[PDB]
Write a protein that binds this ligand. Structure first.
Ligand SMILES: CC(=O)N[C@H]1[C@H]([C@H](O)[C@H](O)CO)O[C@@](O)(C(=O)O)C[C@@H]1O
Ligand SMILES: OC[C@H]1O[C@@H](O)[C@H](O)[C@@H](O)[C@H]1O
Ligand SMILES: OC[C@H]1O[C@@H](O)[C@H](O)[C@@H](O)[C@H]1O
Ligand SMILES: OC[C@H]1O[C@@H](O)[C@H](O)[C@@H](O)[C@H]1O
Length: 504
C-alpha cells in the first residue's frame, strides 16, 4: 500500500474538509468544517474534544456556533436534506474556540460538523467570505493527527438556496435547471426529477417545478408537472419562455434517448402552457411533426432522426415570435447535430424551422443584441477547434444565420450555459455562464463580453467545485438569478447577486 500500516493495534484516523459552498444572510446551521472519524470512538472512550480557529471577521458575521453530530457524511449543509440526514446539534458560544462531547452523546457516530448561524449583514464583495479551521481533535485528552483535504471559504451572496437536493420528494437525483421570471415577477424553477439515478433519457424521469412569488425569498413545495411512466417513457430537458400574451410555455422531450431516436420511433418534443403564472399547466402537446420524422409535412425532414431544444430558456422577440434553438440529428451514420431555430408566430399554435444556424452544433441559446440582431451561443461538443464556445448572428429575427467568430474567446468544456444582455457603467455587454474547467465541469463561472471592444472579461467563479449546467434570469430590481448544477451528485442551486458583487 501507499502508506506503512503498523501491526500493534487498531488506528483511528481523522479527516477534515473545510466548506466552500456559498451562503446568504440569516441562514441556519451552515457547515464551516466537517470532521470524519474512520471508526466509532472505541468502547472505553469517554470524551471527544474539538478545538478550532475562526477569525474575528467571520465571528462578526455569525450569531451562534454549533457542533452537529450525524451518522451520515453529507455533501451539503445538513438542513438541506430536510431531516433525511439525522443529526444532533450542540450549541457553542460564538466566542469559544473549543467544545467537548461525551462518547455517550456521540453514540457511536463518526461525523462532526462545525456549523454557524449567519447574521443579517454583508457587503457581498469578493472578499466577503466566512472561514474556520479545526485545529485539534482529541479523544480522552490524546490528540489525533488531522488530514486536511480542503480549506473553508464560504462566499456571502445576496441569495443562495439549494432548490432541488438529492432525495427531495423521494427522487434520488436532480439535473437540468431551468428558470423563468414572468412579467408579474413570479419565478418558476423547473428540473429533471431523476428519480432512480443521474442518467439521461431513456431513463424514467419526471419534470418537477417550484415557484416563488417573493423574488426567490421563499419557494413552493415541489410539484411533479409531467410524470415519467417507465424506461423509454420519461420526460425532461425543459426550456421556458413567457409569450407576449402572457402565457408561460414549457418545451421538453420525452421517450427514448437522443441517439436512439429514429424518424419512425422518435424521442418526441412536447409543449405545455400555463395561463396563471405556473399554477396550472395544459396536457403535453406533441409537436414533433412540425420538426422531423414520419409525420412531418416537409418530406426533406421526414427522414431526420432526432431533435431537442436546449434546456433553460428560449427567447421571445420584440415582434412576439417565440424561439428555441433545436439541435437536430440529420443522419444515422454520424453522432452529429445541426442547429435550427424552432419558432412560432402564432403563440405556439404552429411551429416552423429556420434555415440551418450551425453545423456540428449542440445545445444552443439565444439573446437579443442592443440593435435587434439575435445572438446564438452554441455548445462545443466533441472538443472541436480550439475548445472554444461557438457563436452566430441573425439580423432577420432568427430565420438565417452566419457564424460570428468575433464573439469567440471563452473556453467551453462542452456544457450548457446561458446569456443575459446587460448594461454596465453605460456599456452594452453580454453576461455568459459556463464552467471554467479547463476541460471539465468544474468552477461555475460568469464572463462579461463588451460589445464595443469585442473582448471578454476574465472569468469570475461563482461556485467553485463540480459545476455543470446553468441558467440565468434578470429580476425586476436588477438582481441576477443564477440557477446552477453544483456537486458531483448534483443539487440545483439558486444564487442571487448584482454584477458589481462579482466584477467590482
Ligand atoms: C435530450 C438529451 O439527451 N439531453 C442531455 C444532453 C445531450 O445528450 C447532449 O447535449 C448531446 O450532445 O447532454 C447531457 O447529458 C449533459 O451533457 O450533461 C444532459 C441532457 O439531459
Ligand atoms: O480518562 C478519561 C480522559 O478524559 C479526558 O478529558 C482527559 O483529559 C484525560 O486525562 C482522560 O482522563
Ligand atoms: O390575467 C389572466 C391570464 O390570462 C391568460 O390568457 C394570459 O396568458 C395571462 O398572461 C393572464 O393575462
Ligand atoms: O470538488 C469540490 C466539491 O464539488 C463537488 O465535487 C462535491 O459535491 C463536493 O464533494 C466537492 O468535491
Amino acid at each position: 500500500g501507499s502508506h506503512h500500516h503498523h501491526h500493534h493495534g487498531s488506528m483511528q484516523e481523522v479527516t477534515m474538509w473545510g466548506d466552500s459552498h456559498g451562503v446568504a444572510p440569516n441562514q441556519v446551521r451552515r457547515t464551516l468544517v466537517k470532521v470524519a472519524l474512520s471508526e466509532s470512538l472505541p468502547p472505553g472512550a469517554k470524551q471527544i474534544r474539538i478545538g478550532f480557529s475562526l477569525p474575528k471577521e467571520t465571528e462578526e458575521k455569525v450569531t451562534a456556533l454549533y457542533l452537529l453530530v450525524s451518522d451520515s457524511l453529507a455533501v451539503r449543509d445538513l438542513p438541506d436534506y430536510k431531516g433525511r440526514v439525522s443529526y444532533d446539534s450542540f450549541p457553542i458560544s460564538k466566542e469559544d474556540r473549543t467544545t467537548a462531547l461525551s462518547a455517550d452523546s456521540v453514540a457511536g457516530r463518526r461525523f462532526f460538523y462545525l456549523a454557524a448561524d449567519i447574521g443579517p449583514v454583508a457587503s457581498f464583495s469578493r472578499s466577503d467570505t466566512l472561514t474556520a479551521r479545526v485545529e485539534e481533535v482529541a479523544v480522552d485528552g490524546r490528540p489525533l493527527p488531522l488530514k486536511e483535504l480542503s480549506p473553508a471559504s464560504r462566499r456571502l451572496y445576496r441569495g443562495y438556496e439549494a432548490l432541488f437536493v438529492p432525495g427531495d420528494g423521494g427522487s434520488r437525483n436532480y439535473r437540468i435547471p431551468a428558470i423563468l421570471k414572468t412579467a408579474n415577477g413570479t419565478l418558476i424553477a423547473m428540473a429533471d426529477r431523476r428519480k432512480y439515478n443521474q442518467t439521461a433519457l431513456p431513463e424514467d424521469i419526471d419534470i418537477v417545478m417550484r415557484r416563488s412569488t417573493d423574488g426567490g425569498k421563499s419557494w413552493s413545495d415541489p410539484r411533479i408537472i409531467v410524470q415519467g411512466e417507465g424506461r423509454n417513457h420519461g420526460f425532461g430537458d425543459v426550456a421556458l419562455v413567457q409569450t407576449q400574451a402572457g402565457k408561460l410555455l414549457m418545451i421538453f422531450v420525452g421517450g427514448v434517448g437522443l441517439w436512439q431516436s429514429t424518424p419512425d420511433r422518435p424521442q418526441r418534443t412536447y409543449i405545455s402552457e400555463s395561463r396563471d403564472e405556473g399554477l396550472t399547466w395544459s396536457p403535453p402537446r406533441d409537436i414533433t411533426h412540425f420538426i422531423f420524422g414520419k409525420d412531418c409535412a416537409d418530406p426533406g425532414r421526414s427522414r431526420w432522426l432526432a431533435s431537442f431544444c436546449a434546456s433553460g430558456q428560449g427567447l421571445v422577440l420584440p415582434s412576439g415570435r417565440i424561439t428555441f434553438v433545436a439541435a437536430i440529428r440529420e443522419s444515422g451514420q454520424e453522432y452529429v447535430l445541426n442547429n435550427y431555430v424552432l419558432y412560432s408566430d402564432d403563440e405556439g399554435d404552429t411551429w416552423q424551422l429556420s434555415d440551418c444556424a450551425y453545423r456540428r452544433g449542440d445545445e444552443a441559446k439565444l439573446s437579443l443584441m442592443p440593435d435587434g440582431r439575435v445572438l446564438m451561443s452554441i455548445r462545443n461538443q466533441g472538443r472541436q477547434e480550439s475548445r472554444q464556445r461557438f457563436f452566430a448572428l441573425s439580423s432577420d429575427d432568427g430565420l438565417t444565420w452566419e457564424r460570428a467568430k468575433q464573439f469567440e474567446g471563452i473556453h467551453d468544456p462542452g456544457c450548457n450555459g446561458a446569456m443575459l444582455q446587460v448594461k454596465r457603467n453605460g456599456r452594452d455587454q453580454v453576461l455568459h455562464s459556463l464552467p471554467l474547467g479547463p476541460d471539465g465541469r468544474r468552477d461555475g463561472a460568469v464572463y462579461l463580453f463588451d460589445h464595443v471592444s469585442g473582448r471578454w472579461s476574465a472569468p469570475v467563479v461563482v461556485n467553485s467545485g463540480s459545476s455543470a449546467y446553468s441558467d440565468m434570469t434578470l429580476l425586476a430590481d436588477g438582481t441576477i438569478g443564477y440557477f446552477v448544477e453544483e456537486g458531483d451528485e448534483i443539487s440545483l442551486v439558486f444564487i442571487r447577486f448584482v454584477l458589481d458583487d462579482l466584477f467590482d
